[PDB]
């Protein structure tokens, strides 16, 4: 083809954590959108089997690291699902070294 790019997700993929989503959607209904932005490799909607049937959120994995960035800033505070007063939040499930607060002496 022209663009092609039919391969596999990068070795170190980024797990984008999406929040502010109602428990009335479906992976086949959410994957599409993102798919238009990036070649999603795997999608999973955090859904417990005890009480957290739906943690009003879902995990997304973009094949290309860069791509994710696009959809992130492209979607983040950009799209607002029906029923949610606030827009859709998009942030990577990364843990930045931190754990301290409490200045003094000015």
Residue 13's CB is within 10 A of a number of other CB atoms, namely 17
Residues 6+ apart with CB under 8 A from 68: 14, 16, 38, 62, 92
Among residues 10, 84, 81, the alpha carbon closest in space to that of 40 is found at 10
Query: Rounded CA gap, 45 and 34, in Å?
Result: 14
Laid out side by side, the sheet with 42-44 consists of: 42-44, 57-62, 14-19, 89-92
Angle, vertex CA 73, rays to CA 71 and CA 79, nearest 5? 80
The whole-angstrom separation of Cα 5 and Cα 7 is 6
Tokens found for residue 81: 């699902």
Helix (H) or strand (E) holding 60: strand 57-62
Strands 57-62 and 14-19 come out as antiparallel
Q: What's the Rg (C-alpha) of the chain? A: 17
Determination approach: NMR
Phi/psi region, residue 39 (left: phi>0; alpha: psi -120 to 50; beta: rest), is beta
């Amino acid at each position: 083809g022209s663009s092609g790019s039919s391969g596999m997700k990068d070795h170190d993929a980024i797990k984008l954590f999406i929040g502010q989503i109602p428990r009335n959607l479906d992976e086949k209904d959410l994957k599409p959108l993102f798919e238009e932005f990036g070649k999603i490799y795997e999608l999973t909607v955090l859904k417990d089997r005890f009480t957290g049937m739906h943690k009003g959120c879902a995990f997304l994995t973009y094949c290309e690291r860069e791509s994710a960035l696009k959809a992130q800033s492209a979607l983040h505070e950009q799209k607002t699902l029906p029923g949610m007063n606030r827009p859709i939040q998009v942030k990577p499930a990364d843990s930045e070294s931190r754990g301290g607060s409490g200045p003094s002496s000015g």
